[PDB]
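Weekly sync notes, structure subgroup
Attendees: PM, AL, DS (notes)

Item 1: joint prediction request from the bench team. They want all three components modeled as one assembly rather than separately. Inputs as received:
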Amino acid sequence: YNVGKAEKDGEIRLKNGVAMSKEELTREDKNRLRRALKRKRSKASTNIKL
Amino acid sequence: YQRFEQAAAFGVIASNANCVWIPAPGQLITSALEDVNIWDIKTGDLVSKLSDGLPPGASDARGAKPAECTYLEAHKDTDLLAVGYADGVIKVWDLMSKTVLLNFNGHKAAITLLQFDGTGTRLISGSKDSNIIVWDLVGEVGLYKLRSHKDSITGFWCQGEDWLISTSKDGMIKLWDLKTHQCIETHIAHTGECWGLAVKDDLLITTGTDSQVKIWKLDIENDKMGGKLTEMGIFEKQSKQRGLKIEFITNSSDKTSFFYIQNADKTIETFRIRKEEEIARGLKKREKRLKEKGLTEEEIAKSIKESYSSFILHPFQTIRSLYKIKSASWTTVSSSKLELVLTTSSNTIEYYSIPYEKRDPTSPAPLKTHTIELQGQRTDVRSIDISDDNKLLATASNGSLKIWNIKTHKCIRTFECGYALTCKFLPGGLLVILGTRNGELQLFDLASSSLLDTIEDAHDAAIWSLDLTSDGKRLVTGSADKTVKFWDFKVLKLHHDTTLELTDDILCVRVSPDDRYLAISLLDNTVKVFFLDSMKFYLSLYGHKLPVLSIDISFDSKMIITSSADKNIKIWGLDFGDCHKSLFAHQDSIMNVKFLPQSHNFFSCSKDAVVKYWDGEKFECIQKLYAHQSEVWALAVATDGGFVVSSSHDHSIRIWEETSLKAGERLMEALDLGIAEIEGLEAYNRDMKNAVLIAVNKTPEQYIMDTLLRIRMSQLEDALMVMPFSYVLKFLKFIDTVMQNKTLLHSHLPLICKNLFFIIKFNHKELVSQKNEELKLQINRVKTELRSALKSTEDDLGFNVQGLKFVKQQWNLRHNYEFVDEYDQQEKESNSARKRVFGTV
Amino acid sequence: GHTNAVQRCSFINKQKQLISCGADGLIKIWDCSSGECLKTLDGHNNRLWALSTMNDGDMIVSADADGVFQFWKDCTEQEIEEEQEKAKLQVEQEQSLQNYMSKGDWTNAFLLAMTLDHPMRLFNVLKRALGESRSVIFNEELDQAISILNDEQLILLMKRCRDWNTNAKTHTIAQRTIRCILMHHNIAKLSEIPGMVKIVDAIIPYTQRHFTRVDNLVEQSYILDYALVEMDK
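Output from the run, pasted for the record:
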């Protein structure tokens, strides 16, 4: 058993086992996690005149 | 090159902000784009103007458009004015000195609301960024941030220190406990956006997007964890549009209360609160009416609840103004009458007086007592002109023409005309000529102050442009009817002379100062130049992708500039029609370009709200002028060229005038601090029988423990070896002290165990040599508890694994198939057995 | 957008929308202003020749060639009414949850966390509730709450316990919660809940590893014994 992607779309689940549902997350947290996902993916006549 | 700066600005009476009325009908404070006006309602003249400084065009002045004022609040007792700006900067103004005192920068968007506390020592600000920040004026610092909202702060109420109610565009009512800086209660105001919020005693009213209005009772001290805000009932206002603002005002003599709901339409609906005796009188009455009707008592009790709102609220009167209302404020409340002040979107101030007696108003419609409309035009100025004497400025707008004195900035005369598109002075500056969109040509005489002559059939469609010869006796008009008509002045009246019909619509006509060339723009993107004396076709400029809007010919008749909606300025030589250069001037359509007299340098304005100064010989942008907030419709240059006049969509006319420790080392420092206090308290307690920890607010065990966590594991072992022994004795006592705190121990049990054993193993020889009896007791205590704590976790793991294995086997018995023949079972197990794919080489 | 011929068309919701029936048997609701298919209704397996609308299309009836009538009724406001009530309830639960955590009323916050399916908040409640316990398993009131959990909540809770157990830094919370379940539930019933066994099959291998560790921590702790016996000499 390898902890993978969250089955429920709203939930975000990481390899360390921490699960966060998007309703919980503050906006700064939501932005921060999105950026981390970005990095992880990357390494892998009238009208005119008037 | 010489420089241009904003010499003066006028024409804006009220901009996009609230209006603040100050008792002396009294004065009014209104926002004028980046400046604040103070008006006198009785006279209608400007009392004073607030401008921070850094006039547009100065080098120290910023290279971006100034931030427009977005909210105004003045504390009457202290006479301090707080001004909010579109960029999220709060400035505190001294009304007496007319200067800024405090400059707060804590919002990342426009400021939507400001509210002085009762004592005038703290200021609460809400901005579009969804944050509410409480400012301390005496401290000039932001105390704390409230950040539960997910959209712009629409309205909030804080009349006492302790509690605050806030509303936002997400449609939420959040109740804040100012001592904890937290949101206690959360309720959904409306299915969509919640815009207005007003609180009177327990009574609280909020407006949604739809005509529905909600009433809530504010039981502050309920302290049930819920119900401190509870819905009372729903009533519907007449206006189906959203309600922007709600404001209470109470009559001191009679204790009567009124409020209005500033709608997003042209209507303000005022309402009255019925007194308690009135409500009981009605409740008794309607129950009799319902009882006489035969309804059951249970039904009657329910219907009363359904008709709950009607008892407290009474529709008082509706105020209907000609223009869309921007902001409003109560002015005076009296038994005889009620008075309101409002500002519209069309740049005017309207003062409404309501005389009433007891329940209902005396007059069917309110009384308009005052208006301030002389120094502003309701509609955007489409064209402007400067008299040859450079004293009088003619400005044409939809439905009105106004004329201003460049020196005194005051309007002199006003004339009603059609949707005026172009306006020019006649030589001597004593007459004015206009071309309306309905196709008529109106002439006005300033001394007469009346329209002299109108030609109803000048053109079959809008007269898009209009120009005069240097002689001043001939007129050229360009219209969408695809024709150019020549008119003469004969004593004054107009006689049509000749008609030239072009293939496509005409957007501009320019006659050269030498009166030899007549430039015409067409909708087919081409500029046609003609010889004025003989009307013989001369040249066809081409290449503009979008139509040319303005044409301007140099004083020497050697350069012609074409500005188009394609964001390009093309300079051409009239000798051969060669395009000297195309300039990507602006970020949007370029509406007007004018040559400075006696020189090749020219100006340009566009929809991007920027006026740019250019060099006609080096083709380089000399200067950028950022003052306006929206489209710059028209531009004008003085005959001398001393100044330039620019008009914008924001109704402003502007005159531009020419002038370290490493791992281990950190741990050693932490041990010295924490164990210094642990020794201190124990000695203090024994006898009875610092700054950094207080600042961080952690107990000494946590501070050292916190430092241990921060050290990376790869550096941890190397960090521990560096410590001299004398700190190892300190380290051991720290572990011993942690032991009493069972919470810390089981939190970081693996970390303590790994570190403790490494210390002992590394310097075991030196440890054992010591004969200290106290050290022997400490390790004995440190021993026994590490075992119990470790055995505690060990016991939990042992219990669960054995129990779970029992869950597994028992389910196997009931729901697993068994093959008596062993060879079959192996095949079954192999397929059922889990399979995973790995790589080989 | 119709795969086959269109046999009926009628305006609904005044000028806003249009509904059409095709031979394929699919009823498509389009938006007149934008010309896009908002919704597709599929209640037939044959061609539709007739289509009647009543109250601007609030009631729509379509008859199949086989003889099947589908009686469609507008429910947009009804679904909107339901969601608004759910949203109102969903907000109150969140705010009540935040207040409880601040006050420390763990036994209630745990229930709210399970209902909302808040993993992070649930973990913090179980964590800092355990922290107080150090100073039967968790505490009398919370342990009672775990006992009352139904089959759906047990499966959800054990799923969280599975994921936490994988991480050696957080397993201590997972093991105690599992212990509380075994001690306060009929083990017979736990086996019968569908999907519990596969979850348990994943918990066991990680639990043994954590048992192999900690044990090694114990034997290493006997270095302190060797220090004392040496010092005593």
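Discussion: Residues 773-815 of chain B form the longest helix (43 residues).
Action: AL to compare against the crosslinking data before next sync.
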